[PDB]
Amino acid sequence: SEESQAFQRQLTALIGYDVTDVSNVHDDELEFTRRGLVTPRMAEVASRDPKLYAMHPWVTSKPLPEYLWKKIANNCIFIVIHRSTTSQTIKVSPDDTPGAILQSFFTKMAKQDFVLRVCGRDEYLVGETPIKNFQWVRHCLKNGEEIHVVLDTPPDPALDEVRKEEWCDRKFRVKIRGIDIPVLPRNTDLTVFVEANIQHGQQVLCQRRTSPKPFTEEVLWNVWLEFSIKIKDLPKGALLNLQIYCGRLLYYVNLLLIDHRFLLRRGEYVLHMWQISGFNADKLTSATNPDKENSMSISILLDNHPIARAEMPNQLRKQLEAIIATDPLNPLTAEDKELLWHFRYESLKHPKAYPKLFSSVKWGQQEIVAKTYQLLARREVWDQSALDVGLTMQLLDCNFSDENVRAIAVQKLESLEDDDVLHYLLQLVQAVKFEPYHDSALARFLLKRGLRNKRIGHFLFWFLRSEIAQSRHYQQRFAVILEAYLRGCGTAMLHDFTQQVQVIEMLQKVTLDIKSLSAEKYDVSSQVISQLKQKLENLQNSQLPESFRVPYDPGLKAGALAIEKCKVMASKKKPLWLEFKCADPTALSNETIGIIFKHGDDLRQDMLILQILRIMESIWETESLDLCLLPYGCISTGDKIGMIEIVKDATTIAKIQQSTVGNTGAFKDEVLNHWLKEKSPTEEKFQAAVERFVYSCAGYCVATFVLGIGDRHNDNIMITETGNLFHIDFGHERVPFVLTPDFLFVMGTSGKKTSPHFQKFQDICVKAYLALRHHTNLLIILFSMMLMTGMPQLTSKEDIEYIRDALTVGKNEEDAKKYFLDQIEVCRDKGWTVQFNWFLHLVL
Ligand SMILES: CC(C)n1nc(-c2cccc(O)c2)c2c(N)ncnc21
Incomplete structure (x- = not known):
């Protein structure tokens, strides 16, 4: 119809990509995924509560932290309701519901459908939650601020209405016909071959190179390439990974061997390839380069149909338990793998063994894959374990291409409250880049959670749209998912x-x-x-x-x-x-x-x-x-x-330094403290300022060391008028972080002595540090995924390993405490050195 075509023009404009364009496809996986997402979209549209969706309370079940309780010395909470320009102040208990608070106001004013909305903001205090368990309420306590709220009508659920939609045992072989690019790179002529990998979970199941040949604008081979693997042994989600070396990796493309209808991939292909820049998630995509004009191609021919215990000894369990307790970047030895596999049943009793266990599977052997599937059918220990978000993210990373291993991770994400989804949402969206297929359990989880909650939906939109506008490698997949979201959000x-x-x-x-x-x-x-x-x-x-x-x-x-x-x-x-x-x-x-x-x-x-x-x-x-x-x-x-x-009310530390003298990299130890007192109307607020500066300085010193971004120039550290240090601009001799002598002077200390605020600062850094270390595994997996989905070509040991060492893995709490205090001292030793080194550098 001529309105379903307009609504689709609306969608294309919102998405910034056309999900009906088929100029860069060679099968219908994208179309099939659009039809497929109709069902879960519609299931979530129909079962969502109109009232709570429109109003989208932002809530949590976590306890109010001890530091926020101490800001309620009375078991009462002051809330202020508004009308016309009138206002009264209702004393309230933390455990009180919004419902209960209205009837202790309506009675307080009188002896008709209304809801409390936050002044200034599309945000509501509604639903069966204690008022202390609303996020806006927790924000107003943290910040020393009065909870301000209007009285008005619930917003019409009708506004959120959704538009009805009108919807064998032979070896595997590939023929490499040849390659063709219109313009040859640049240097001279260096030789070129094609490397064809069978890949599963970034694991190479088998590999075969063509003969070397001269690198001309057009090179031909006409060779069958016989692999060691049999056809019946190809696992679902195996990629044919085609690569071209000269010298030396210059181009790559990928073909899913098995498709979305479980059919072996048959026939002629001309695949347009991506060029390397000058290991990461871009190298994994099943999308082809859409620039058919400048880009290098490969031509191939596939002509190959279907398919769909007894108790341990003692020191071996010690071995098994040692392997299990070990961190997520610890290389599994062949010895270790076979140990996990042989004792798979004992391994299944430990939900933490799962990543290493499923990374001990020979995915290139059908009978073993099948045994793995029988393993997981009996996942009752898995299904009862508390959600461990770090464990789960490991299963959704680049090392697992099996739908069934990946689905039990998604299943566990289901018990995440909206509050927790919000925290992991950007990396779950990025983890879509590790799915072999466009329609996954992870895509459907994001769709459903998006649709259930406007706040999640909103961010889902922008996070998907961010990738759709910049990544050639994944825009098609992300666009199909975004459309599906848009087709049900309202x-x-x-x-x-x-x-x-x-x-x-x-x-x-x-x-x-x-x-x-x-x-x-x-x-x-x-x-x-x-x-x-x-x-x-x-x-x-x-x-x-x-x-x-x-x-x-x-x-x-x-x-x-x-x-x-x-x-x-x-x-x-x-x-x-x-x-x-x-x-x-x-x-x-x-x-x-x-x-x-x-x-x-x-x-x-x-x-x-x-x-x-x-x-x-x-x-x-x-x-x-x-x-x-x-x-x-x-x-x-x-x-x-x-x-x-x-x-x-924020200024850079650099600026604060350049106001006094404004020099060629000169620096003053005392100016930060003088700036603070200037900006604080009372010595009272000034001590509130030195306070926040001690906490905030500590937060950023720890955080920033762990992520490996602590060595910054002054221009990129800021402070608020009220004491909050914060780092800015993370877009890509040495110092582990910026604790400079101006920061040190605010702490009432000068090059190598102690003070009450600096003792405080040290011990807070230690408390905060060793608190991250309790979630060591979760941080290692976020960091790793970050590096693979976020930057250029990073190292599957070297760059990733930084955080292991920085979180000082496998150390008792006293070594760690020590290591980190030694870093506090490297910053003292060095003082202005690095900061001054930048202005030396601008001439260097
Ligand atoms: C102007 C000052 C240097 N400044 N830079 C800021 C930037 C932060 C992060 C990235 C930027 O490009 C710039 C900034 C901010 N976000 N908020 C307030 N002030 C800010």
């Missing part, structure tokens, strides 16, 4: 989304136009500032949505530019610092929503780092630590371009 979220896209479409247009106008020369010129104001005026008239939702903070609705406060910014890239009126008349404050828009950097790395930071704060929350990190908002929108939350 007409009110589609509207909201459509506006958000329109805004960052316009603003990035402006961002790029301004980069051209002042090249590199560091001055911000008056002429180029003068165009920025013109261009923004223009969009505010007859182009820019009256109001859009802040992608990194979907509660907030931004309204109109404050053109006056906007400015092209003083860096080499030319980011737009932008400020917006809030569109909500009931906002308590009058402050602006600030957003930095910038091209030049890969913001996906920034996203990855920030999200680990959040995870890290949650870990510290499980042990009643609060490190006052400031994991600011940040979303990649396109190629080397995206948005960043502006943090209020």
Whole structure:
């Protein structure tokens, strides 16, 4: 119909890719996955509660941490309800429901359907949760702030309405006909061959190279390549991995040997390949290069149909248990593998053995695969174990291509509350890049969770859209999933989304136009500032949505530019610092929503780092630590371009240093402390400032050491007026982290002595450090996946191994404590050295 075609034009615009275009396909897996996702979409659409979906309470079952209780010395919580311009203050108990609080207000005012919504924000205190278990309430306690709330009507569930949809035993062999590219690289002519790997879980089941031959624009072989593997032994999800070396890896492509209908892949292929840049998730994709013109191809012919205990000794269990207790980057020896396999049944009793156990399977042998499947049919120990998110992520990584091993991981994710999904969501989305097939249990989990909760849905959208606009390697898969999400999120979220896209479409247009106008020369010129104001005026008239939702903070609705406060910014890239009126008349404050828009950097790395930071704060929350990190908002929108939350009342440490003298890399030990007292109206708030600085300094020193990003120049560390240190700009002699003598002086100490605030700082660092170490396995897997889904060509030992050593694996708590305090001292020894070394470097 002529409306299903319009609705699909809507979808294409939101997605930024056309899921009906079939110019870069060679089978129908993408189409098949669209039909396939209709069922789980519709199952979740129909069973979701209209009321709770529209209002999307943001809630948790975790206990209020000890540090937040201590901010309620009375078992009462002060909440403030509003109308017209009236307001009263109801004393309330933490265990009280929102329901119970209304009837202790309606009675307090009178002796009809209303809900308490947060002032300034699309966010609600509704549902059968104690008010202490709402996230907005926990945020207002953390921040020393009054819980402000209006009284008004539930939003019409009807607005969320969804549009009805109108939906043998021979060896395997491949023929390498030849390769063809129109323009030959650059250097001279070096020789070229084709390497054909049979690959499963990044494990090479078997390998065969063609003969070497001259590297011309056109090279032909006409060779069958016989593999050691039989056809009946190919596991589901095995890739034919075709690669080309000269010298030396220059090109790769992949073909799924078995397809989405379980059929062996037959016949002629001309595959357009990806070029290497100058191990990671890009190397794994079943997508072909869509640039059919510049790119290198390979031609092949497949012509090959179906298919679908007794008790241990003692020191061996010790061996088995030692292997099991060992960390996720510990290489399994052939000895070790056979041990796990032979004693698979005993191994199955330990949910932690699972990664190593399933990575001890010979996936290239059908009878053994089958035994593995019989192993898992009896997974009752697995099904009763508490969710261990780290274990689960290991099974969803690049080392497992079996649908059945991967599905028991997904099954375990099911008991994650929405709160926890939010924390892992970006890496679960990235883990879709390790699925052999487009339709997986992991894709369907994300779809369902997205659809069940607007907050999850929102972020799912932007996280998928981030990959769809930048990764040639996975945009088709991510687009099919995004469409499926969009086809059920509701007409009110589609509207909201459509506006958000329109805004960052316009603003990035402006961002790029301004980069051209002042090249590199560091001055911000008056002429180029003068165009920025013109261009923004223009969009505010007859182009820019009256109001859009802040992608990194979907509660907030931004309204109109404050053109006056906007400015092209003083860096080499030319980011737009932008400020917006809030569109909500009931906002308590009058402050602006600030957003930095910038091209030049890969913001996906920034996203990855920030999200680990959040995870890290949650870990510290499980042990009643609060490190006052400031994991600011940040979303990649396109190629080397995206948005960043502006943090209020913040300045760089560099700036604070350059105000006093503003010199050629000179530095002052005392200026940070003087800046703090200046910004604090009372000595009272100043001690609240030195406090936050001690915690926040400690948070970032630990976090940042663990992730290996601690050696930063001053320009990229900031502080709020009220004491919060935070690192910025993670987009890609030495120091383990930045504890400089100006930081040290705030702590009431000077090069090599002690103080109350520095004793505090040390011991907090130790508490926080060894708290991360309790989740060593989870952090190692996030880091690893981060490196594989987030950066260029990284090392499956070397780069990954950094975090093992940094988390000082396999050490008792006293060695660790020691190691980390030794790092606190390397920073003291060195002082200004590295910081000064940068200005030495700009001439170097
Ligand atoms: C202007 C100052 C140096 N600054 N840089 C910021 C950046 C942080 C992260 C990446 C950037 O490109 C810039 C920043 C912020 N997010 N909030 C407040 N102030 C900020």
